[PDB]
Design a protein around this nucleic acid. Structure first.
Lengths: 252, 404
DNA sequence: ACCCACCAAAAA
RNA sequence: UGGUGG
């Protein structure tokens, strides 16, 4: 039941990986038939969908920024920028020469944007995380990516013991503080965006109990980072305040 | 090191979040005692409202005798400078950043703010209208310790102000500053990656990623497209930041090992050290046990991680008295510790222990040879750096505001 | 010529 | 390309 709840949470995370989930809005969910249209204007299918996706993310983006995300499709940096003009001239999105940016035209639905805001980022585990024994897998039951942050994988010793020790610290939400933030933080002070969906996630998270585990990953140097956006003892002050130990103690 | 009650760490933490975190311990508790009965109304003017409120609600729950899950926070005062001071034995740098105690003429131990101390020293000598803001000075200092030459050149120009800035740094922290100096001249123009091992076995690999700029035309106007690519570079400015950060990383892993320990593992190792454990042996433990003990020998940093590889056969290669001494230096009751690289949070009835464990680690770095051990791996040959004051470590154990 | 990690996406 | 924490 909690094992099942954990698999559901992981089910949502795996289904809302940002870029694959966005692509769905331009492939199998668009009324527009971008495959057919991209053939017409002589733009590679996978490239065109990705450019459309990048525009739904950035909304506005200068040229060096936009080619960076798409550079891996062509043998030349130049080939990418030309393809982008062909699409801008065919109204896939606009380029405004007076601000030197592309501006999105076709954006994803609001309903899909909210699921991405809730679930594209890792959540806490509601069972004890998997014991790490190799430098693959980060504690969840369905991810087996490199445990080291960014592209810095090694199979050398990176002190899994510390990750394993931090991962089993049970945490819970202080709803008294969490409610204080939503009702009164805005008049005490990126924040609105986080808080729009944070409480919904925290309630879903703790559906089976106010007890959970944050996963931890090392960067290449050995600084240790707890993974997650909405619930995290690292990161923002409105974030820090809500977390406490699940194993409370009488102080004296 | 003076100790505090569990409730007092709560008092300090609530003071910190108001916050008067640069005040001495007793002034902070004095401020608290004064506002104990009015805390909920100060939430709206506190520096960290949410954290202030959580701590205050915890204080109330404690008064009523209720259990709490709220962890108080104790932060390192300039983590990096502390580590460079300990690596180099730089007693003057240590006094900037609470690695050892600084007393004013009255003789009270003060909570020093290195950036302010150096800001004062710079106005004191520049004098007579010095056109420099305290925060422009803090940015230049902290970017320098991570190896920047461009940012102090921007705050101080490239003239006499810069000259006074480097002069001040060289009197207040000669060895720390000389070491940062040295790291710059330590890049290898042939290297694609740097690798070093920490004494607890963490392998640090730094791939050298250099900018490749493809230039592009879009409407016959030019755009520069820069992508990080693996390569080499003549100098490199990254080693001071990465080595220093690898060490505060180490301090975090090891501090969490010493605080959040498995009491049953501890008792097994204690019997194992005293020859009373039932025979158990695995051939796979030998390599790692040998490896970690070696780092202790070469560095002075005995990691409690070694408990994971000690068995009936492997204990024979280590000094059982050193293992027992380590366990005895650990807290008598374990506790969870949350860490933000150089911030530490725990239940307040363990406040005293977390400050003791941090002190011991700074002191270990101070006493031993970690810098040589790491520099040798970075530059590719055996080098030895000496302590500028080899007894600094004695005072480090007893220092007051390392965490504040 | 400053380290890392991460988020965040903009208006007739 | 701006912000978050260190």
């Amino acid at each position: 039941s909690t094992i099942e709840h954990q698999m559901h949470l992981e089910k949502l995370y795996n289904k809302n990986q940002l870029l694959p989930r966005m692509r769905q809005e331009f492939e199998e969910n668009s009324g527009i038939d971008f495959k057919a249209f991209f053939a017409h204007i002589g733009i590679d299918y996978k490239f065109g969908i990705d450019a459309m996706v990048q525009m739904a993310l950035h909304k506005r983006a200068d040229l060096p920024t936009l080619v960076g995300t798409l550079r891996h499709h062509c043998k030349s940096a130049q080939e990418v920028a030309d393809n982008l003009f062909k699409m801008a001239s065919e109204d896939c999105f606009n380029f405004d020469p007076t601000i030197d940016k592309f501006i999105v035209i076709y954006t994803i639905s609001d309903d899909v944007q909210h699921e991405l805001d809730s679930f594209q980022y890792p959540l806490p585990m509601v069972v004890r995380p998997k014991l790490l024994t190799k430098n693959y897998g980060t504690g969840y039951f369905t991810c087996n990516k490199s445990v080291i942050l960014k592209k810095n994988h090694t199979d050398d010793d990176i002190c899994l013991d510390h990750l394993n020790r931090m991962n089993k610290i049970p945490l819970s939400i202080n709803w008294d503080v969490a409610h204080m933030v939503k009702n009164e933080w805005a008049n005490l002070d990126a924040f609105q965006k986080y808080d729009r969906t944070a409480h919904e996630v925290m309630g879903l998270l703790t559906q089976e109990g106010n007890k959970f585990y944050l996963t931890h990953r090392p960067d290449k140097r050995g600084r240790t980072y707890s993974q997650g956006y909405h619930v995290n003892y690292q990161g923002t002050s409105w974030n820090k305040a809500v977390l406490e130990f699940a194993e409370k103690e009488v102080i004296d | 090191m003076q100790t505090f009650t569990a409730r007092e760490y709560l008092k300090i933490d609530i003071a910190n979040n108001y916050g008067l975190d640069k005040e001495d311990w007793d002034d902070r508790i004095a401020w608290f005692d004064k506002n104990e009965n009015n805390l909920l109304n100060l939430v709206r003017e506190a520096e960290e409202p949410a954290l202030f409120y959580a701590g205050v609600k915890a204080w109330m729950d404690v008064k009523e005798g209720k259990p709490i899950g709220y962890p108080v926070a104790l932060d390192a005062t300039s983590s990096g400078l502390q580590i460079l001071a300990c690596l180099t034995g730089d007693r003057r740098a240590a006094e900037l950043c609470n690695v050892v105690n600084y007393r004013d003429e009255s003789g009270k131990v003060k909570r020093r703010d290195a950036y302010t101390v150096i800001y004062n020293k710079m106005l004191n000598t520049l004098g007579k209208g010095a056109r420099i803001k305290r925060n422009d000075c803090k940015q230049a200092i902290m970017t320098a310790l991570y190896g920047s030459e461009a940012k102090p050149k921007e705050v101080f120009g490239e003239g006499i102000m810069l000259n006074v800035f480097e002069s001040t740094m060289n009197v207040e922290a000669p060895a720390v500053w000389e070491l940062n100096k040295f790291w710059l001249q330590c890049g290898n123009p042939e290297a694609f990656v740097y690798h070093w091992v920490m004494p607890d076995g963490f392998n640090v690999y730094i791939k050298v990623m250099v900018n490749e700029v493809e230039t592009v035309h879009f409407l016959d106007k030019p755009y520069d497209c820069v992508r990080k690519v693996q390569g080499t570079e003549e100098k490199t400015r990254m080693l001071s930041a990465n080595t220093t950060h690898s060490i505060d990383g180490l301090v975090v892993r090891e501090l969490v090992r010493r605080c959040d320990y498995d009491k049953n593992q501890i008792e097994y190792i204690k019997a194992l050290c005293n020859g009373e454990a039932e025979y158990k042996a695995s051939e796979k433990n030998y390599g790692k046990a040998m490896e970690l003990w070696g780092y202790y020998e070469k560095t002075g940093f005995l990691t409690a991680r070694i408990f994971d590889y000690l068995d009936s056969e492997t204990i024979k290669l280590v000094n059982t008295q050193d293992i027992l001494d380590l366990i005895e230096s650990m807290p008598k009751k374990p506790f969870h510790v949350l860490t933000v690289h150089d911030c530490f949070r725990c239940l307040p009835n363990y406040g005293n222990d977390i400050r003791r464990q941090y002190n011991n680690l700074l002191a270990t770095i101070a006493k031993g040879d970690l810098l040589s051990f790491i520099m040798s791996q970075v530059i590719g040959q055996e080098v030895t750096i000496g302590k500028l004051d080899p007894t600094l470590w004695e005072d480090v154990l007893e220092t007051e505001y390392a965490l504040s």
